Write a structure and sequence with these properties.
mainly alpha; binds (3~{R})-1-ethanoylpyrrolidine-3-carboxylic acid; 65% helix; 113 residues
């Protein structure tokens, strides 16, 4: 029961808050490229990759029709990083801050929707 443009306007500020965390968004702004990074094991562990640029493109092109599909992609992003990376790593620690930021902000948006 959502217009494509009202859903986008509602959820976009939540994505921007993730993207604007500096430095914590930096490992998440682009899809992981195992070839470029030289980590051939990546897609053996992460079957369904996700990142902030992919989420933005989906929010911009009507690929979310209910709020929970957007929320699922954000958690797929967090959970991929928490599965592949060491708990002490920059990526894991940065993921944990992005999740805090998401949690602290997503509740009213989902209430208003
Ligand atoms: C966000 C994430 O899970 N990543 C795994 C490898 C790390 C990197 O090496 O860039 C990025």
């Amino acid at each position: 029961i959502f217009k494509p443009e009202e859903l986008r306007q509602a959820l976009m500020p939540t994505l921007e808050a993730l993207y604007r965390q500096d430095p914590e968004s930096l490992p998440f702004r682009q899809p992981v490229d195992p070839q470029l990074l030289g980590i051939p094991d990546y897609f053996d562990i992460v079957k369904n990759p996700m990142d902030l640029s992919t989420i933005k493109r989906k929010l911009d092109t009507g690929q979310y029709q209910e709020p929970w599909q957007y929320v699922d992609d954000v958690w797929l992003m967090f959970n991929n990083a928490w599965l592949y990376n060491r708990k002490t790593s920059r990526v894991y620690k940065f993921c944990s801050k992005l999740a805090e930021v998401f949690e602290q902000e997503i509740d009213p948006v989902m209430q208003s929707l």
